[PDB]
Amino acid sequence: DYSWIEKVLEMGLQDSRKRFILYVASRYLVNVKGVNEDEALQTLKEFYYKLQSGKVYESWLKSVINGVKKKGLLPWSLKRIEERDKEMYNEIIRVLKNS
Numbered sequence: 001d002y003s004w005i006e007k008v009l010e011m012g013l014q015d016s017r018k019r020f021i022l023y024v025a026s027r028y029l030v031n032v033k034g035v036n037e038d039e040a041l042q043t044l045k046e047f048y049y050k051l052q053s054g055k056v057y058e059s060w061l062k063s064v065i066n067g068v069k070k071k072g073l074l075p076w077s078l079k080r081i082e083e084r085d086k087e088m089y090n091e092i093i094r095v096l097k098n099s
Contacts, residue, residue, distance in 0.1 A: 013088070
């Protein structure tokens with residue numbers, strides 16, 4: 001399971017990038033895959049700039065990674081994402097689907 005997260009991380013998203021990082025990818029990387037802060041940071045930043053419009057702060061990314069690690073937060077399921085964030089859900093699915 002969770003394969004879909006790796007795929008999204010590889011391909012990138014659009015308007016939902018920051019929320020995907022906060023609610024899903026950071027928590028997966030840290031709390032499920034158990035990678036360390038430096039790897040999480042690079043992985044998250046590399047994902048973010050798959051678009052080339054926009055900017056993200058390292059200080060934001062480091063804070064997210066630390067916060068999710070401290071609280072042990074779990075990535076939102078596809079089900080919850082459908083329920084709460086259809087914008088992100090469509091961006092995720094469209095990546096999974098066009099593959």
